[PDB]
Every structure is written in C-alpha cells, then in structure tokens.
Design a protein around this nucleic acid. Structure first.
Lengths: 77, 46, 63, 93
RNA sequence: UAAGGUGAUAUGAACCGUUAUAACCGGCGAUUUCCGAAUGGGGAAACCCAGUGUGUUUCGACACACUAUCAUUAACUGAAUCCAUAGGUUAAUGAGGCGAACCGGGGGAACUGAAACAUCUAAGUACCCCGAGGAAAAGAAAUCAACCGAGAUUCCCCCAGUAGCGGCGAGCGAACGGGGAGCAGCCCAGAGCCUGAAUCAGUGUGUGUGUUAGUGGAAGCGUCUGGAAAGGCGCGCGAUACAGGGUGACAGCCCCGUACACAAAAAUGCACAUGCUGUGAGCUCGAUGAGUAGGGCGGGACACGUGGUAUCCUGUCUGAAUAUGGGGGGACCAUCCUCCAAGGCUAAAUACUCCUGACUGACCGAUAGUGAACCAGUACCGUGAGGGAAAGGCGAAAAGAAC
RNA sequence: AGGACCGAACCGACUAAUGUUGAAAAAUUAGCGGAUGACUUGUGGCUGGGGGUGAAAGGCCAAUCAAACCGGGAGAUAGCU
RNA sequence: GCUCGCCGGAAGACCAAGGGUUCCUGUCCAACGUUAAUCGGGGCAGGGUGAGUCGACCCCUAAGGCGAGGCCGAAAGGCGUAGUCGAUGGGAAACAGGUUAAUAUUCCUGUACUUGGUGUUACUGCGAAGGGGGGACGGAGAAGGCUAUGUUGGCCGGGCG
RNA sequence: UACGGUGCUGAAGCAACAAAUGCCCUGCUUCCAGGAAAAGCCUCUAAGCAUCAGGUAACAUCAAAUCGUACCCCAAACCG
C-alpha cells in the first residue's frame, strides 16, 4: 500500500468514467515519495513516505504540531 | 496395464496429508469443510 | 513430614512416593513369581491412593 | 548423583515366552511386562534394586498389530513392548 | 442428597458398605502425557534435533526451567565512530488459537427484465477477503423546514405507487411529515463562583426474590373375565392436584411427579437501601476552530441516467471571509430564514445462535422426516475438490434353546 | 572419432492375425524396427483454465477438453416439450 | 511313497517401493478361494519381530519449497538477501559359521574394527563461520598390472560294475 | 536314549592357463558441446592455551541414544 505516513492517506474505490455509457472501475492510487525530517525531542533525522494532499498539510501546519504528536504508540520510527 | 494413479503414501501425504493441507488457506478450508460434512478421517495417509 | 506439621518443604513427598509406590507396585505384580498370592486385580492398593501424595508434592505451602 | 531411584516405577507382571520362560524362568532367564516406554537402561537397575542380582543380558523389542480381539467390533493388540532379562549368577527371580 | 454401589456390554474374585471419601450431584480449584496457537529451531496428526544456565560423576551423560514473533515500557551492552544510535541482551504488558448466528469495511459478477440490447433493471445480490463487539452501525446540526416551526439516531405502520429520475422506455422510486415502539445527551477550543450536592459504573456488605445440588404433597377396595388388566361391575372416595412419562391390555386414587409450600457451604442474576473509589448537582462571564470551506477539472454516494444539476464523500491542482462575515435552503441571483464546519464521544427500542429456560405444530413415522433414528458421512467412487448407501421394532420378562 | 551399417539388455508402433459382453479402460502372438542420440532413464521437484504444454493435431493437460473437473449464482431462461 | 512332466536369464535367487498379523502350530470347515475342500494369504486362537557396527538418523546440502529484517498487494497470496528444510549427491562404526516350528549382518561361536572416556608407552603446536590442498563431477578411446569364473592334472575319498 | 535327532569328529584343501557385464579407475590418453556446491578430511595462521588441551604411531580397559525390523514381490500379500 502507498500510504502517506504523515496523514494516513490510502488508495480509494472509484470509477474512471468518460463520455461513454459503459462504466468501468479505476481504484484511485496515490503518487508515493520519501521525505526526511528532524525531531528536536529525539535529536535525529527520520525518513517517512509522503504523497499529494498529505505532503501539503505537514509543511503548512509545521512539524512541531504534526510529527511531534504523530506516534499512536511508537510505530518504530 | 498401467494406471494414471500408482500407489504412493509419500506423494499422497505431500498433497492431501493433514499438515500439508493445514499449511495452506484453501487446504485448511478443505479441512474446515471436512468438519462441516462430518468426515471421520482428516488424513487418509496415516 | 507428618500431617500434624505445617509449611514444610513439599519436595520430601517425592520420597514418600519412592517408599510407597516405587518399592511396592512392581513387587505387588511380581510376588506371583515367588508363588505368593498370584491375583492381578490388586492395583487399587496404589492407584487413586498415591494420588494424594502427589497432590501434596504439588502443594505451595512451605515451598 | 549420579543415577537416582525416582525412575524405577518400571516393570509390570510376569510374561511368558516359548524362547525362555518355558525352560529358564527359575534358572537363568525371565520375561516381564512393561509400559509404552520399556525403559531399557532402568530395567536392570530395577532388578538390582529389588532382587540384588546382577544382570547379564537385556532385550525388550516391540510386538505390532495382530488380528481380531472382538466378535462384533474391530480389535487388535497394536504396538506393545516386553522385557527379557538374563542373570549373571542368580537363578530364581 | 443418600443405601445400595464399584460406567456398559459382565460376569466372578476383590473392594466401600449401610457409621464421620459407598456411589451420585452443586460450588471453586487443582492435576492435564504428545500432537496442536505452540511461543528454541525443524516438521510429518500425534514425530525429529538443538541451545542457555547450574549441578553431579567411573567428569562413560544425565535433567531441571528456560529460549518465538510483532508493538510499547524500563535496564545493561553496542558497529561504521568519540559521545551516540542501528544492531545485541534481560525483565514486563498487549496480541496470537478457539467458539453458533448476527455485524462494520474491502474485492465484486453473470443470469434476469427491457417479449431484442449496451444505458437502465438485476445488485452492491452471489461468492471471496479483512476485522470486530455482546451487539455491530447511526446521533442531538455550517441538519431539517418554510415565515409555521422542527430540534438526535434506529425499528414499525404509513406518507406513496405521489414527488423526482427515466432509451419520456422497461421501470427505479423518495423527502417533508403523521401515527407508534423507544426517549440521556455532552465536552474541548476556559476561568471563576457553588460544594462536593444530580446521575452511572465498579467494589466491601446488607435486605427482598430467583438460578445452579432438593423432599414433601389427597383418595381404590372387592368381585369377575384372562396365563396376565391400569378392563367390566358394584359403587366408594379425593381433585387449588384428572399434565406428561413409567409400571404386564385403558391409572384421578401403584411409581417419578402436579397444584400448593419451603431451604441454603459456595458461586451468581434482578430489584430496594448504604459505605468506599472514580465521575460531579447548581450559578455566571468569556470565547466560536484555516491546507480546508470555496474555485477550476474529474469520480463516488444520492430514488435521481449528463441534464438547465443542488448536496455530501473524494482524486488533483489551487486556497478564503469577518457582521455592509460565512455555509445551506436541489440550476443561478437577490431577499430572507436557519445553521456556523474546518475537534472528540454516545443510550437500546434494532440483529442473531452453538448455548440456558418456558411454550407450540390442522408435524413425519424406517423409501416418511435430514442422505443419515441403525457404531452413516461408516461401506463405496475419484489423483482431488467433491460425491455416497444397505440397514429399526421376539417378549411382560432372557425366561435365548437344556434334554 | 561418428545426429554411422547389423544387433542383446533397454526401447517401441508400423504391418498382419487373435482378442472385442474381454484376462483387458488397449492386451496378446509373429515380424519389421529405435539403441552414443536432436537419445533414453531411476529418484524428487516445477508449468493451470483462455492458462499450461506442443520440431504445433486445437493433440496432450489423471478415461473428460473449439475449452477440463468439482461446487455455487441455479429450481436462471425455453411463444416449446 | 515311488514315478512322471514342464520352466530353468524363469515358471529361479537376493534388495526396494507399496501393502499390512499376511510368518509359524494348533485347530475349524457356516461364509470365503464364483468347486471339491480334509487345503488355505479363509474362520478362530496361541506363539513370533533379540541390532553400538546392517537401511534411516548423524554432519553438509543440489533442483525446489519456505522465508526474517525489507519490499509488493484491500487481501488470499507473493518477490528477494540471511536463515531453514531436502537429496536422486558428498560425509565415522561387522564378517561368515549354524541355530528356531516360525528370527537374525539382530541369536551363540570365532575373529575384526569405528566413535567417546579413562589408563599405558615414545614423538609433538593445537586452532576460526577466515586462508590453501581436497571433496569435485563432460563425452570417448587405449596401454599396463589383475580377479570373480572354469577345466585338466596333482591331491583326497568313493567305485570297478 | 531315540536307526527316533543332535551333536561330536573329519580327508585333500594346489598352480597351469583362459579370464566377466567386476578392479587399480575420481586412473592414463584424447576431445569440444569446456562438464554442482558445502561440510567432514588434510593443511596455514589469527583468537585462545600450557609439564594442559589438541596433533601422530602402538595398546589395554569401560561405555555405545533413537527410527526400522513379523511377510510377499515381475507377483494370490503392490496396482489394475
């Protein structure tokens, strides 16, 4: 799965559809990249998987209000 | 004459044997369906 | 050692099984070879009875 | 220790063999019954601990299947073991 | 609770008896070989082979108690590389497998109808997958109406075969809202005043009453027939008890029972009262969420099909306002009402069964009813998924075959 | 030396005959032939459904196959029987 | 019991898969072997399966399967580097005498040896999950030195019709 | 003892020649299609260690888990 590790964006069910009367499945897949961040509480760099719409959130909110509260129990990152 | 099945408890226990079936989702489901029909044997090699 | 005592080490009830079962149950079935008693249905004399010694070996008091 | 008496729960009633018992049961060689483990090393310890005689030979084997044991059901003797003991100078066990 | 028992084919010896473990049962709580989550590693239906640590001894091989994976918590160690950290080790918690049916999410048809076919219908069915609770799911508004106002959701009868959609075909098919079942709403964006006041769960108890081991409870005799009656007859008597079942042909009066009535080691449901812990009744004043709503483009879910197409999800780019502000009201605009997102949670009225209990059938009776009342999913067929029988009823009693 | 001439073991299908409710789910009897190869073979694996495998017949894929077999939608549909 | 016949590279001997009480004595003759059955792999009992060295295990591992950490996938499932199974391969341990109704490189006899410990005697650097040699791999042909195998003679015992 | 089986004893026990589909052979020689790995084994050193332990030749003496084991077989015991 192409998961945006910084937001939980996953693939979704959906149809292609065009100007045609016959309708066929698509299932929307994300574009998937990596990005590296600094954690001032652990004084180390970490690498996370990122995607469109999701990578737009973290840069806007700030890592000290996103990545600094992202662990649900630890997730070994 | 020759038969398409020749007797072999080694290759029967490899395809249809209890642990061999159990080690696959579908073979473990054959065993679940054996229990649903109530078949007295779950292996015919041992 | 004896049932009037409290919180002794439970491990000594394994020697009770040495005395009361290991030195008894085979001789009970073998004395027939010395011409003695010769009946076979006698194992009730250690069966169900020695289970109470094992229950006391498995006891936590004094361990 | 080495070797402890805690293992000597071994052996059962006398047994019969045409190969020994019918000429040696009172003079040199006897046959006995056992559990599912025949306890090959502890047989001779259990003889030394009960009858104080040294052992010269020990065999146990395993006897298998053998047909019919019921007049209306399936029945067998299945897998079962024995003990065949020969004495060093002892006679009558 | 109880005197006959030690399961049955099964008898006998032996063994408890009848007296403070006889058998039988209720409570809780041990014992639980090997396979099997299987947890050292390997693997094969019941098998195979190691390690860590300690001890013992002819220091010829014994044998405890422990070692999985993932996530988190701590403690020591630690590579490139100092410090560090990956990596290594040790202790702890959480998960693992199983269990009937229901249930959220995911993958997703064809047939069928359109007397023909693709859109539409059929169907988010069928089947497969993931995951989980005693229910799952929903919720008290940037919702719904229409100037009247509603004030959660679900379930039921309806609204309505109407609106709306629709090759303007076949047909799919509402909402508003009524009658009903069933009624708990709150907090964060933030502080004080009030005083621990309302309400609910948990836990030490109490009381009332059930549940899991129970024993008491009224009357029928004679005579005849028959090998034998629960029958005929004489009539007699009980009934808050004429229900099953059992006993040798029809039992209200023979047995287990019924109506009617209690009793308590331990475990435990319902309801009344109470302590404790956690939550905190009431008053008052602030304050109203910016990478996500819009906007272009495209899907999904809407009863609703590309149309003049609102709304809510959602892929992608892009990204906002402050009271002469913002969302919505099914094109769009104004006016106007209503809500104010961009934070989190929710009663069971509903769904269901392996199980527990009560009730019931104008149910069948050995080819019936399940294929299966019977050592049946056995025999038997196929390499395999998967197919698949024959076969019940001597008698009241074993008295069952001597001589 | 040999994709060489004949030829046991080994292999094997071409002709002929017998068999054909059989001994038989393809054999038997006789012969011609393959036998260092582009071969054959013991043992265990790997290739699957419009997919496999094929010096390639839509042949072979456990007797089945212009699309295998079992179980389901399925008691689908039949202006007909 | 005497006699005959056929097979004799099988119609024989040994090993294995696969099956499973079949072995032997002791009896039984309903059913079975499409019969007779006194036989029997049939009925029903009783007896029988003796291993340090044999086949397996050991230790390594090919094809292939599984597969961590890691990756792909809603997911069933799968990729791939360690690791772990696995030989059809590479690696320690017994021969031929005669015995039992039925067993045997399993017994008893004689003789032999590998593994592990301890004692004896002389000489002594042993050692990675690392380094080297080996293990270790095709097809065919042709030299050397032989042995099972077999007869003659020798030698032995028997015979002389 | 039992002509009943069950033991004891015991003659000769050689080389001449041909050699099988078997050895020396994982050979030698030749060839193009140029033909598994690893561990045991032997050997090198690191680590570590000492009249040890390990390494070699010759020996005495004690010990040696577990699986398998009955029977058939080009076939009446496999399968048809």
């Amino acid at each position: 799965s192409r998961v945006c590790q910084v937001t939980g964006k996953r693939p979704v069910t959906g149809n292609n559809r065009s100007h045609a009367l016959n309708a066929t499945k698509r299932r929307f897949l994300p574009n998937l990249h990596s990005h590296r961040f600094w954690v001032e509480s652990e004084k180390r760099f970490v690498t996370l998987r990122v995607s469109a719409k999701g990578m737009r959130v973290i840069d806007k909110k700030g890592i000290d209000t996103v990545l600094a509260e992202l662990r649900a129990r630890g997730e070994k990152y | 004459m020759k038969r398409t099945f020749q007797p072999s408890v080694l290759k029967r226990n490899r395809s249809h044997g209890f642990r061999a079936r159990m080690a696959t989702k579908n073979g473990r489901q054959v065993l679940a369906r054996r229990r649903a029909k109530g078949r007295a044997r779950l292996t015919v090699s041992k | 050692m004896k049932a009037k005592e409290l919180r002794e080490k439970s491990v000594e009830e394994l020697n009770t099984e040495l005395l009361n079962l290991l030195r008894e149950q085979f001789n009970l079935r073998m004395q027939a070879a010395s011409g003695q008693l010769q009946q076979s249905h006698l194992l009730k004399q250690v069966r169900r009875d020695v289970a109470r010694v094992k229950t006391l070996l498995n006891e936590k008091a004094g361990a | 220790m080495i070797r402890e008496e805690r293992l000597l729960k071994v052996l059962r009633a006398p047994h019969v063999s045409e190969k020994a018992s019918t000429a040696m049961e009172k003079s040199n060689t006897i046959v006995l019954k056992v559990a599912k483990d025949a306890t090959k090393a502890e047989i001779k310890a259990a003889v030394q601990k009960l009858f104080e005689v040294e052992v010269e030979v020990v065999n146990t084997l395993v006897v298998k299947g053998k047909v019919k044991r019921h007049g209306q059901r399936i029945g067998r003797r299945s897998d079962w073991k024995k003990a065949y003991v020969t004495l060093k100078e002892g006679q009558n066990l």
